[PDB]
Design an enzyme around this catalytic site. Structure first.
Site, short mmCIF file in Angstrom:
data_model
loop_
_atom_site.label_atom_id
_atom_site.label_comp_id
_atom_site.label_asym_id
_atom_site.label_seq_id
_atom_site.Cartn_x
_atom_site.Cartn_y
_atom_site.Cartn_z
CB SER A 157 -1.09 -0.09 1.07
OG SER A 157 -2.05 0.94 0.86
CG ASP A 163 -6.03 -1.46 -4.56
OD1 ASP A 163 -5.30 -2.33 -4.05
OD2 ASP A 163 -6.27 -0.35 -4.03
CG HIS A 183 -8.71 -4.79 2.15
ND1 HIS A 183 -10.07 -5.00 2.25
CD2 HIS A 183 -8.16 -5.40 3.22
CE1 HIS A 183 -10.33 -5.71 3.33
NE2 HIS A 183 -9.18 -5.97 3.94
#
Ligand SMILES: CCc1noc(C)c1C(=O)Nc1cc(C)on1
Ligand SMILES: *[C@@H]1O[C@H](CO)[C@@H](O)[C@H](O)[C@H]1NC(C)=O
EC number: 3.1.1.98
Length: 341
Positions: A145, A242, A287
């Site tokens: 991330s 995403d 995620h």
């Protein structure tokens, strides 16, 4: 378990001035080193950072960190959980700078917070060289991330640092998980990054900076624009749909307008990866990240991520039955049966 070491140079700090640090588990029979950058969004002004300090303080301070952490996924030392690099030296670098790993600004009379992400990475590397990194053959800088974007922003600086310090034989590579975003139109962000860079004194890789020039450095936070300027080998992991991308796009019984929006997003993401030879991009809405225990389960075209990473290692010594470019072509979330639930 990986054990905590606070940085010996106490001037390299988290947001609130407390020392930054790293968690380490050594493997004395291995010359491979994995340094993983944690994620967790960012903050871009005084009021926004004050809110994060109240309810996300571990991402801004080391005062409450635990003395140990458990390595999971790619950080696990068990072969059954980590078929790729289970015997490597393992390092987890906590994210306590709120700057996408880009900052180089200390706390002072004019700055309530320190934003030192780029300097934290450099100091961790320097202190590890005396704990065995000096003998490494490969240093893999990985992250998820905001840490995945951090890999793209920092991998070439680590390679340059090691060359200037006198370690030309260490091969520096990057693994960017869930950090490859599109500056697209919303269904119903770039300004926050632009403001953030000024607030953090953020720094970007030099070739990308020279392309986009003064005031336009925010462009280098987007994978498809910064990736072509990098010299170190980088493997890109990105879900086609995403969840963080969809959150910033304001997407949450789907009618035609939204169907076309989601299909176009997957097509655009796939297009940006066409000339990325080492990549893993499944057609899933997720995620989930590569430090999860069941990271081995997802497959693209019959090949798992741990296998693709192993094939990448072999390529850096195409290979029969050992692919490294794995991007789904089907156009809707979960059209790949192996997507996480
Ligand atoms: C790049 C900084 C970052 N670090 O963690 C996250 C999440 C982000 C982020 O901004 N993701 C975006 C941006 C757009 C547009 O779509 N998705
Ligand atoms: C500690 O780090 C800061 C920032 O990188 C640097 O200016 C300083 O020289 C370092 N201290 C030592 C003793 O190396």
């Amino acid at each position: 378990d990986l054990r905590l070491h606070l940085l010996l140079n106490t001037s390299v700090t988290c947001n609130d001035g407390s020392p930054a640090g790293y968690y380490l588990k050594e493997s004395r029979g291995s010359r491979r080193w994995l340094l993983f950058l944690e994620g967790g969004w960012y903050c871009f002004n005084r009021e926004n950072c004050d809110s994060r300090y109240d309810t996300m303080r571990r991402l801004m301070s080391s005062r409450d960190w635990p003395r140990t952490r458990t390595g999971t996924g790619i950080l696990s030392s068990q072969p059954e959980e980590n078929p790729y690099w289970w015997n490597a030296n393992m390092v987890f670098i906590p994210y306590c700078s709120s700057d996408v790993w880009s900052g180089a600004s200390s706390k002072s009379e004019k700055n309530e917070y320190a934003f030192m992400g780029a300097l934290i990475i450099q100091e961790v590397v320097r202190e590890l060289l005396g704990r065995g990194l000096s003998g490494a053959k490969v240093l893999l800088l990985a992250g998820s991330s905001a840490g995945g974007t951090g890999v793209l922003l920092n991998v070439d600086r680590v390679a340059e640092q090691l060359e200037k310090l006198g370690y030309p034989a260490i091969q520096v590579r990057g693994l960017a998980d869930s950090g490859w975003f599109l500056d697209n139109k919303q269904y119903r962000p770039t300004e926050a990054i632009r403001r953030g860079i000024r607030y953090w004194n953020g720094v970007v890789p030099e070739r990308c900076r020279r392309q986009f020039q003064e005031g336009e450095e925010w462009n280098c936070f987007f994978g498809y624009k910064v990736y072509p300027t990098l010299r170190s080998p980088v493997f890109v992991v990105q879900w086609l749909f995403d969840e963080a991308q969809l959150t910033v796009d304001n997407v949450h019984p789907v009618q035609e307008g939204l169907r076309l929006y989601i299909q176009n997003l997957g097509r655009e993401l796939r297009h940006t990866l066409k000339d990325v030879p080492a990549s893993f991009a499944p057609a899933c809405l997720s995620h989930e990240i590569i430090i999860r225990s069941h990271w081995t389960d997802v497959q693209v075209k019959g090949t798992s991520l741990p296998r693709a990473l192993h094939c990448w290692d072999r390529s850096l010594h195409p290979l029969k039955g050992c692919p490294v470019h794995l991007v789904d072509s089907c156009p809707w979330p979960h059209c790949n049966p192996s997507c996480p639930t």
